[PDB]
Each structure stands twice: as structure tokens, then as C-alpha cells.
Amino acid sequence: MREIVHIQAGQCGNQIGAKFWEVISDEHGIDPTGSYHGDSDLQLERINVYYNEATGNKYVPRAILVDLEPGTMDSVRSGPFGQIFRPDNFVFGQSGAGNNWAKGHYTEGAELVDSVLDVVRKESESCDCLQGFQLTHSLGGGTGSGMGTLLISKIREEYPDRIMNTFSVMPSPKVSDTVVEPYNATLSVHQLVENTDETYCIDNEALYDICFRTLKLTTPTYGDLNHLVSATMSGVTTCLRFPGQLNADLRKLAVNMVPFPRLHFFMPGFAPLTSRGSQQYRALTVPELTQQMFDSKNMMAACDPRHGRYLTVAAIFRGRMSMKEVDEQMLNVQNKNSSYFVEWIPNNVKTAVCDIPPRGLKMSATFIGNSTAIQELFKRISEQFTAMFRRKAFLHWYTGEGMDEMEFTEAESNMNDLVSEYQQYQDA
């Protein structure tokens, strides 16, 4: 009975969080009304990790929906699975955060955060044994970035010995909302370096390029990007939701994946990435799933892993397949590309298999990599930050909320320190 408390904050966080709960509710056989209509015992064996039990076999997500404006959470509540969430777990304000980290972190968000913590406390108090927390959000906006990292700081103060885990969407100029996203992401990344144990880095540019290049989607939408994240989130949390021996809980996963406290930002990946039509019903093979999983084009951080080295790797295969062939193909990726795995962490590539594949697929695979190539992502953000901050451009939006320039200078320094830390271990 190791429970996880899920939190989704802001527009991006709630739209991705809604699709995630839609995807896994289908996997666990939970309909939009919270009723179980599955056909397998595996669907219910570890369902308490994400769902509470209500009166009459009703399963309710242990999820908390947070925003500073009502719009997106009104859409969630009107969506397909919107009726399944606890009504009291909707915590929203009215003013918005105007894509401003300071508003989310210091002014607008500060007025709302205590009521969010009341709901978090109520959910934690019903946990037989709380693992920790899972937060979905973006770093480029105001609520998910600013109020999201404010929530992490206050949760760590109240639950200092619980695991804190995030799925964090990194901004990119290619798929951008406002010019201030590098400011918001740089301020948030420093919060994440200090107060999370695992962060999955989801780069919107990589998601876009995957939809355009590999999937042949001419004009991708946020809906297409979010379904790709939901599939990836379903795969990475398979170890938590179904019977398994590897990374069975959040703390063992972190012990296995994080050799240095600050280097805890993972590059995820998903397979299959298939274009529609013709070669779409083709039976997938483990060799094909494996080659896709480690191809750079299929990773969602827009970092070339050949420009760095993996510290640790967790690969999870879903479906009825040959675990012998899984071992062979996995040992064939390392033993052929040994230049891209560090040699001072023996056996740093772990593989797990789960028999339940995502709905409508015979098999699939998700990849979790702790790679020093992720410094490329932080370098991009740091460069875009400095191009504006050197001229103090758009700073008045933040100084008007009470911040001063010194705080920006420190966040910049911290991320350049993080980049230097990754480069140290890439040459070890």
C-alpha cells in the first residue's frame, strides 16, 4: 500500500495530467465514472498507488488539480474523464499568473498555496504508507513553473523524508508562448535542482520534431504532443502501477538512477513511433523496439546522447514477448555503443518487462536515461536567458512583483554550475 499523491499545476500541467489519468484509467480498467470493468487481476493489484477506494468499488484518482485561473480546469471537468476526479481536489484562483514566474511564486501563487497544501495534507493523511509526490507542470509559464516550484518547496518542508518527482516540460523557441519562458525556466530549474529527487525533462521541441519528422504529422497540435507525453508517462510509471521487481517504488528508483544528488534530470523516450497507413499494422519486434528506443530522434529532451554519456539507464518493455530476446537486444546496444555508457558504474543499464501493454498495442517500450548530454538542454536555456538579461529586457514584469536583479543573477549562476557539473562527469 505505497501510495503516490499526484499534483498537476497550470495549463500545461493540467492538460497533460488529464490525458495521463485518461490513459492509465483505461489500463487499470476504470471507466469515466470510477467503476472497474476490467478482466485481469493485474489491473487492481497495485491500483492503490494512484487510486483511492470509495464506497461501492469506486476508484478515485489521488490527484490534485491546481491553477491560478479557472479556464483549463473547467475544460478538464468538462472533458471525458473529468467526472472521475475528486471535486474538492480542484483548487483554483481567478487572477491568473500572466506567464510570470514571480506571480506564481511570490504574489498570486502565495495567496493560493495554503489551500492546495490543505488538500495535499488531507490526501496524505489517508495514505497507509506514502511514497511521495508526482507533479506535472511546465517551466515556461507562470503557474506551473512559479507556483509549482513554490508547492514543491512547501511540500518538502512538511514532508522532508518523502520522494519528490516531477514531469517538467522545458520551453523551446520553436514551440513558444512568450519571450519570457527562458526567465521562468531558469528560475524554476534551480528550484528543481534542490528540491526534487527525479525530474523527467520533456522538451516541447523534441515532441514537435518527433510528430513532424518521424510521425509525418504536418501540423502537430498540443493535443498530439500531450498524448505522446501521456504514453511516455504511462510507460515510465509501469514499474509503480503493476507487479514488478525493478524500480518498484520511488525511492529504489532514485537510488538506482541518481548517483549524484543534483544530477537527477532524466531523458525519457517511447517506442513505437509509427506513421499511420500501410506499415502500421506490422507486427513489432523486440529488435525494432530497442533500436527505436535508443535512437536520438526518438528522445524527448532534444539532446544528442552521442554528445554525452549515460550514467544510468532504465528500459521497460510492455507486452507478451521473449524476456530472453529482451536481454539479448539490450546487451547488444551497450556492447556495441560502449562509448556512450560510463565505465565507473558497473551494470548501469537495468531492464524490466511488464505483461500488460498499452491499449491497442501488442508491445511497447519506454526508456529512462540519466545522461550528461542533458547539459545541452540547460545550455540552450542559459544562452536564451543571457541574451535577454544582458540588456535587462522584460525584467520590469518581474521587478514589479518584488523581485530584484540579484535573484536573476543567482539563478543564472546556479544553472551554469549545473552545466559544469555534467561536463565534469562526461569526461571522467
Binding site: 518547496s153 518538502r156 518542508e157 522532508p160 523524508d161
Partner: protein, 54 residues
């Protein structure tokens, strides 16, 4: 090749074959170790909470 100490019972037997002759911390100390480690955990947590209070 000598067989010595051949002992036989209903459930089996045993013998020996020689082919060639030849040529703690106290309870008090454990508690201090465990309590000293607990002290270091509590110090590190107090430092974290001081950092979050700032």
C-alpha cells in the same frame, strides 16, 4: 588411503579418508553507533529546515 572413524546407523554412515598427512562490541557501544548516526540525520534535516525557513 586410510578410512578412519567409520560410524554406521540405520539412516546412513560417515567416515574420513586421509590420503596424505600434513607437513566483540558491547550493547552500549552499538547504541552509541546507532544514536550517533541518528544524530547526523537530525542535524542534516535541521540544516534543510533552516534553509527552507530562510
Amino acid at each position: 588411503m586410510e578410512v578412519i572413524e567409520l560410524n554406521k546407523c540405520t539412516s546412513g554412515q560417515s567416515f574420513e579418508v586421509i590420503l596424505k598427512p600434513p607437513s566483540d562490541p558491547s550493547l552500549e557501544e552499538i547504541q552509541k553507533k546507532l544514536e550517533a548516526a541518528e544524530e547526523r540525520r537530525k542535524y542534516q534535516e535541521a540544516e534543510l529546515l533552516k534553509h527552507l525557513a530562510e
